Amino acid sequence: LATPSPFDMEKMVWLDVNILEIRKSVLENFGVDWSKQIPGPFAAFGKDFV
Amino acid sequence: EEMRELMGAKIRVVGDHVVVDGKNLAPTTLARVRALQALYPKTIV
Numbered sequence A: 001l002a003t004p005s006p007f008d009m010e011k012m013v014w015l016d017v018n019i020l021e022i023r024k025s026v027l028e029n030f031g032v033d034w035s036k037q038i039p040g041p042f043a044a045f046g047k048d049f050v
Numbered sequence B: 001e002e003m004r005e006l007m008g009a010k011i012r013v014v015g016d017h018v019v020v021d022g023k024n025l026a027p028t029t030l031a032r033v034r035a036l037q038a039l040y041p042k043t044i045v
Helices: B002-007 B027-039
Strands: B011-013 B018-021
Touching (some): B002 B011, B002 B027
């Protein structure tokens, strides 16, 4: 004849979460940028024998 | 007599078989009443 409870009282849990992030960066661009591919010498010949 | 004590809104009368009556009974009370149905085959609700 005994009956159960409508529900059981559970235990409560507290959650504490921490997220930490640090970012650092450097960027350098120094100097002189010369050309590396340049035209060279040329030579041509032409003649009419007849 | 055994039925009467186990429930003491219902009305208990002897008649010729065990008779149980009531107007607005809670589901728990009805479930308890028909739980006692396993004590005597000659039961009506």
